[PDB]
Coordinates of all heavy atoms in Angstrom, one line a residue:
Chain C
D22 N 274.5 -57.2 89.1 CA 274.4 -58.6 89.2 C 275.7 -59.2 88.6 O 276.2 -60.3 89.0 CB 273.2 -59.2 88.5 CG 271.9 -58.7 89.1 OD1 272.0 -57.6 89.8 OD2 270.9 -59.3 88.9
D23 N 276.3 -58.4 87.7 CA 277.6 -58.8 87.1 C 278.7 -59.1 88.2 O 279.4 -60.0 88.1 CB 278.0 -57.8 86.1 CG 277.2 -57.8 84.9 OD1 276.4 -58.8 84.7 OD2 277.3 -56.8 84.1
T24 N 278.7 -58.2 89.2 CA 279.8 -58.3 90.2 C 279.7 -59.3 91.4 O 280.6 -59.5 92.1 CB 280.0 -56.9 90.8 OG1 278.8 -56.6 91.5 CG2 280.2 -55.9 89.7
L25 N 278.5 -59.8 91.6 CA 278.3 -60.7 92.7 C 279.3 -61.8 92.7 O 279.4 -62.6 91.8 CB 276.8 -61.2 92.7 CG 275.8 -60.2 92.7 CD1 274.4 -60.8 92.7 CD2 275.9 -59.2 93.9
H26 N 280.0 -62.0 93.8 CA 281.0 -63.0 93.9 C 280.3 -64.3 93.6 O 279.2 -64.5 94.1 CB 281.6 -63.1 95.3 CG 282.5 -64.2 95.5 ND1 283.8 -64.3 95.0 CD2 282.3 -65.4 96.2 CE1 284.3 -65.5 95.4 NE2 283.5 -66.1 96.1
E27 N 280.9 -65.2 92.9 CA 280.3 -66.4 92.5 C 280.2 -67.5 93.6 O 280.9 -68.5 93.5 CB 280.9 -67.0 91.2 CG 280.6 -66.3 90.0 CD 281.0 -67.0 88.7 OE1 281.7 -68.1 88.9 OE2 280.7 -66.6 87.6
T28 N 279.5 -67.2 94.7 CA 279.4 -68.2 95.7 C 278.5 -69.3 95.1 O 277.8 -69.0 94.2 CB 278.7 -67.6 96.9 OG1 277.3 -67.5 96.7 CG2 279.2 -66.2 97.3
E29 N 278.7 -70.5 95.7 CA 277.9 -71.6 95.2 C 276.5 -71.1 94.9 O 276.0 -71.2 93.7 CB 277.8 -72.6 96.3 CG 279.1 -73.4 96.4 CD 279.5 -74.1 95.2 OE1 278.7 -74.3 94.3 OE2 280.7 -74.4 95.1
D30 N 275.8 -70.4 95.8 CA 274.5 -69.9 95.6 C 274.4 -69.2 94.3 O 273.6 -69.4 93.4 CB 274.0 -69.1 96.7 CG 274.2 -69.8 98.1 OD1 274.6 -70.9 98.1 OD2 273.9 -69.1 99.1
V31 N 275.4 -68.2 94.2 CA 275.4 -67.4 93.0 C 275.6 -68.3 91.8 O 275.0 -68.1 90.7 CB 276.6 -66.4 93.0 CG1 276.7 -65.6 91.7 CG2 276.3 -65.4 94.2
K32 N 276.4 -69.3 91.9 CA 276.7 -70.2 90.8 C 275.4 -70.8 90.3 O 275.2 -70.8 89.1 CB 277.7 -71.3 91.2 CG 279.0 -70.7 91.7 CD 279.8 -71.8 92.4 CE 280.0 -73.0 91.5 NZ 280.7 -74.1 92.2
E33 N 274.6 -71.3 91.2 CA 273.4 -72.0 90.8 C 272.5 -71.0 90.0 O 272.0 -71.4 88.9 CB 272.6 -72.4 92.0 CG 273.3 -73.5 92.8 CD 273.7 -74.7 92.1 OE1 273.1 -75.0 91.0 OE2 274.5 -75.5 92.6
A34 N 272.3 -69.8 90.5 CA 271.5 -68.9 89.8 C 272.0 -68.6 88.4 O 271.3 -68.6 87.4 CB 271.3 -67.6 90.6
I35 N 273.3 -68.4 88.3 CA 273.9 -68.1 87.0 C 273.6 -69.1 86.0 O 273.1 -68.9 84.9 CB 275.4 -68.0 87.1 CG1 275.9 -66.9 88.1 CG2 276.0 -67.7 85.7 CD1 277.3 -66.9 88.4
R36 N 273.7 -70.4 86.5 CA 273.4 -71.5 85.6 C 272.0 -71.4 85.0 O 271.8 -71.5 83.8 CB 273.6 -72.8 86.3 CG 272.9 -74.0 85.7 CD 272.8 -75.2 86.7 NE 272.4 -74.7 88.0 CZ 271.1 -74.7 88.4 NH1 270.2 -75.2 87.6 NH2 270.8 -74.3 89.6
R37 N 271.0 -71.2 85.9 CA 269.6 -71.2 85.5 C 269.4 -70.1 84.5 O 268.4 -70.1 83.8 CB 268.7 -71.1 86.7 CG 268.8 -72.3 87.6 CD 267.9 -72.1 88.8 NE 268.0 -73.2 89.7 CZ 267.3 -73.2 90.9 NH1 266.6 -72.2 91.3 NH2 267.5 -74.3 91.7
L38 N 270.2 -69.0 84.5 CA 269.9 -67.9 83.6 C 269.6 -68.3 82.2 O 270.2 -69.2 81.7 CB 271.1 -66.9 83.6 CG 271.5 -66.3 84.9 CD1 272.7 -65.4 84.7 CD2 270.3 -65.6 85.5
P39 N 268.5 -67.7 81.6 CA 268.2 -68.1 80.3 C 269.5 -67.9 79.5 O 270.3 -66.9 79.8 CB 267.2 -67.0 79.8 CG 267.4 -65.9 80.8 CD 267.8 -66.5 82.1
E40 N 269.8 -68.7 78.5 CA 271.1 -68.6 77.8 C 271.4 -67.2 77.3 O 272.6 -66.8 77.5 CB 271.1 -69.6 76.6 CG 272.5 -69.6 75.9 CD 272.7 -70.8 75.0 OE1 271.7 -71.6 74.9 OE2 273.7 -70.9 74.4
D41 N 270.5 -66.5 76.8 CA 270.8 -65.2 76.2 C 271.5 -64.4 77.3 O 272.6 -63.9 77.0 CB 269.5 -64.5 75.8 CG 268.5 -64.4 76.9 OD1 268.6 -65.1 77.9 OD2 267.5 -63.7 76.7
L42 N 270.9 -64.3 78.4 CA 271.6 -63.5 79.5 C 272.9 -64.0 79.8 O 273.9 -63.3 80.0 CB 270.7 -63.4 80.7 CG 269.3 -62.8 80.5 CD1 268.6 -62.7 81.8 CD2 269.5 -61.4 80.0
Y43 N 273.0 -65.3 80.0 CA 274.3 -65.9 80.3 C 275.4 -65.5 79.4 O 276.4 -65.1 79.8 CB 274.2 -67.4 80.4 CG 275.6 -68.1 80.5 CD1 276.2 -68.2 81.8 CD2 276.2 -68.6 79.4 CE1 277.4 -68.8 81.9 CE2 277.5 -69.2 79.6 CZ 278.0 -69.3 80.8 OH 279.3 -69.9 80.9
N44 N 275.1 -65.7 78.1 CA 276.1 -65.3 77.1 C 276.4 -63.8 77.2 O 277.5 -63.4 77.0 CB 275.6 -65.7 75.7 CG 275.5 -67.2 75.4 OD1 276.1 -68.0 76.2 ND2 274.9 -67.6 74.4
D45 N 275.3 -63.0 77.4 CA 275.5 -61.6 77.5 C 276.4 -61.3 78.7 O 277.3 -60.5 78.7 CB 274.2 -60.9 77.7 CG 273.3 -61.1 76.4 OD1 273.8 -61.6 75.4 OD2 272.1 -60.7 76.5
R46 N 276.1 -62.0 79.8 CA 276.8 -61.8 81.0 C 278.3 -62.0 80.7 O 279.2 -61.2 81.1 CB 276.4 -62.7 82.1 CG 277.1 -62.6 83.5 CD 276.5 -63.5 84.5 NE 277.2 -63.3 85.8 CZ 278.1 -64.1 86.2 NH1 278.6 -65.1 85.5 NH2 278.7 -63.9 87.4
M47 N 278.5 -63.1 80.0 CA 279.9 -63.5 79.7 C 280.5 -62.3 78.9 O 281.6 -61.9 79.2 CB 280.0 -64.8 79.0 CG 279.4 -66.0 79.7 SD 280.1 -66.2 81.3 CE 281.8 -66.6 80.9
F48 N 279.8 -61.9 77.9 CA 280.4 -60.8 77.1 C 280.8 -59.7 78.0 O 282.0 -59.2 78.0 CB 279.5 -60.3 76.0 CG 280.1 -59.1 75.3 CD1 281.2 -59.2 74.5 CD2 279.5 -57.9 75.5 CE1 281.8 -58.1 73.9 CE2 280.1 -56.8 74.8 CZ 281.2 -56.9 74.0
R49 N 279.9 -59.2 78.8 CA 280.2 -58.0 79.6 C 281.4 -58.3 80.5 O 282.3 -57.5 80.6 CB 279.0 -57.6 80.4 CG 277.8 -57.2 79.5 CD 276.6 -56.7 80.4 NE 276.4 -57.5 81.6 CZ 275.6 -58.6 81.5 NH1 275.0 -59.0 80.4 NH2 275.4 -59.3 82.6
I50 N 281.3 -59.4 81.2 CA 282.4 -59.7 82.1 C 283.7 -59.8 81.4 O 284.7 -59.2 81.9 CB 282.2 -61.1 82.8 CG1 281.0 -61.0 83.7 CG2 283.4 -61.5 83.6 CD1 280.7 -62.3 84.5
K51 N 283.8 -60.4 80.3 CA 285.0 -60.5 79.5 C 285.5 -59.2 79.1 O 286.7 -58.9 79.2 CB 284.9 -61.4 78.3 CG 286.2 -61.7 77.6 CD 285.9 -62.5 76.3 CE 287.2 -62.7 75.6 NZ 288.1 -63.6 76.4
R52 N 284.6 -58.3 78.7 CA 285.0 -57.0 78.3 C 285.6 -56.3 79.4 O 286.7 -55.7 79.2 CB 283.8 -56.2 77.8 CG 284.1 -54.9 77.2 CD 282.9 -54.2 76.7 NE 281.9 -54.0 77.7 CZ 280.7 -53.5 77.6 NH1 280.3 -53.1 76.4 NH2 279.8 -53.4 78.6
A53 N 285.0 -56.4 80.6 CA 285.6 -55.7 81.7 C 287.0 -56.2 81.9 O 287.9 -55.4 82.1 CB 284.8 -56.0 82.9
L54 N 287.2 -57.5 81.8 CA 288.5 -58.1 82.0 C 289.5 -57.4 81.1 O 290.5 -56.9 81.5 CB 288.5 -59.6 81.8 CG 287.6 -60.3 82.9 CD1 287.5 -61.8 82.6 CD2 288.1 -60.1 84.3
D55 N 289.1 -57.4 79.8 CA 290.0 -56.8 78.8 C 290.3 -55.4 79.1 O 291.4 -54.9 79.1 CB 289.4 -56.9 77.4 CG 290.4 -56.5 76.3 OD1 291.5 -56.1 76.6 OD2 290.0 -56.5 75.1
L56 N 289.3 -54.6 79.4 CA 289.4 -53.2 79.8 C 290.4 -53.1 81.0 O 291.3 -52.2 81.0 CB 288.1 -52.6 80.1 CG 287.1 -52.6 78.9 CD1 285.7 -52.4 79.5 CD2 287.4 -51.6 77.9
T57 N 290.2 -53.9 82.0 CA 291.0 -53.8 83.2 C 292.4 -54.0 82.8 O 293.3 -53.3 83.3 CB 290.5 -54.8 84.2 OG1 289.2 -54.6 84.6 CG2 291.4 -54.7 85.5
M58 N 292.6 -55.0 81.9 CA 294.0 -55.3 81.5 C 294.7 -54.1 81.0 O 295.8 -53.8 81.3 CB 294.0 -56.4 80.5 CG 295.4 -56.7 79.9 SD 295.3 -57.3 78.2 CE 294.7 -55.8 77.4
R59 N 294.0 -53.4 80.1 CA 294.6 -52.2 79.5 C 294.5 -51.0 80.3 O 294.9 -49.9 79.9 CB 293.9 -52.0 78.1 CG 292.4 -51.9 78.2 CD 291.8 -51.9 76.8 NE 291.9 -53.2 76.1 CZ 292.9 -53.5 75.3 NH1 293.8 -52.6 75.0 NH2 293.0 -54.7 74.7
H60 N 294.0 -51.2 81.6 CA 293.9 -50.0 82.5 C 293.1 -48.9 81.8 O 293.4 -47.7 82.0 CB 295.3 -49.5 82.9 CG 296.1 -50.5 83.6 ND1 296.1 -50.7 85.0 CD2 297.0 -51.5 83.1 CE1 296.9 -51.6 85.3 NE2 297.4 -52.2 84.2
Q61 N 292.1 -49.3 81.1 CA 291.2 -48.3 80.4 C 289.8 -48.5 80.8 O 289.4 -49.6 81.2 CB 291.4 -48.3 78.9 CG 292.8 -48.3 78.4 CD 293.6 -47.1 78.7 OE1 294.8 -47.0 78.7 NE2 292.8 -46.0 79.1
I62 N 289.0 -47.4 80.7 CA 287.6 -47.6 81.0 C 286.8 -47.2 79.8 O 287.3 -46.4 79.0 CB 287.1 -46.7 82.2 CG1 287.4 -45.3 81.9 CG2 287.8 -47.2 83.5 CD1 287.1 -44.3 83.0
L63 N 285.6 -47.8 79.6 CA 284.9 -47.5 78.4 C 284.5 -46.0 78.3 O 284.7 -45.3 79.3 CB 283.6 -48.3 78.4 CG 283.7 -49.8 78.4 CD1 282.4 -50.5 78.7 CD2 284.2 -50.3 77.0
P64 N 284.1 -45.6 77.1 CA 283.6 -44.2 77.0 C 282.6 -43.9 78.1 O 281.8 -44.8 78.3 CB 283.0 -44.2 75.6 CG 283.7 -45.2 74.8 CD 284.1 -46.3 75.8
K65 N 282.7 -42.8 78.7 CA 281.9 -42.5 79.9 C 280.4 -42.8 79.5 O 279.7 -43.4 80.2 CB 282.0 -41.0 80.3 CG 280.9 -40.6 81.3 CD 281.0 -39.1 81.6 CE 282.4 -38.7 82.1 NZ 282.7 -39.4 83.4
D66 N 280.0 -42.4 78.3 CA 278.7 -42.6 77.9 C 278.3 -44.1 77.9 O 277.2 -44.5 78.3 CB 278.5 -42.1 76.4 CG 279.6 -42.6 75.5 OD1 280.8 -42.3 75.8 OD2 279.3 -43.2 74.5

Side-chain angles (χ1 to χ4, degrees):
Chain C
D22 299 19
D23 290 345
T24 67
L25 304 181
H26 172 80
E27 287 192 349
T28 76
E29 289 300 338
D30 307 355
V31 174
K32 298 167 55 183
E33 299 298 345
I35 299 173
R36 159 193 50 90
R37 295 178 182 175
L38 298 181
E40 183 166 359
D41 52 349
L42 296 183
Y43 169 82
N44 290 348
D45 300 350
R46 179 174 183 267
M47 302 304 293
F48 171 68
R49 299 185 313 276
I50 294 183
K51 184 186 182 63
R52 187 176 54 183
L54 298 175
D55 186 2
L56 301 159
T57 301
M58 175 211 65
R59 51 192 69 266
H60 298 269
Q61 311 295 163
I62 58 184
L63 296 169
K65 174 186 297 299
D66 47 302

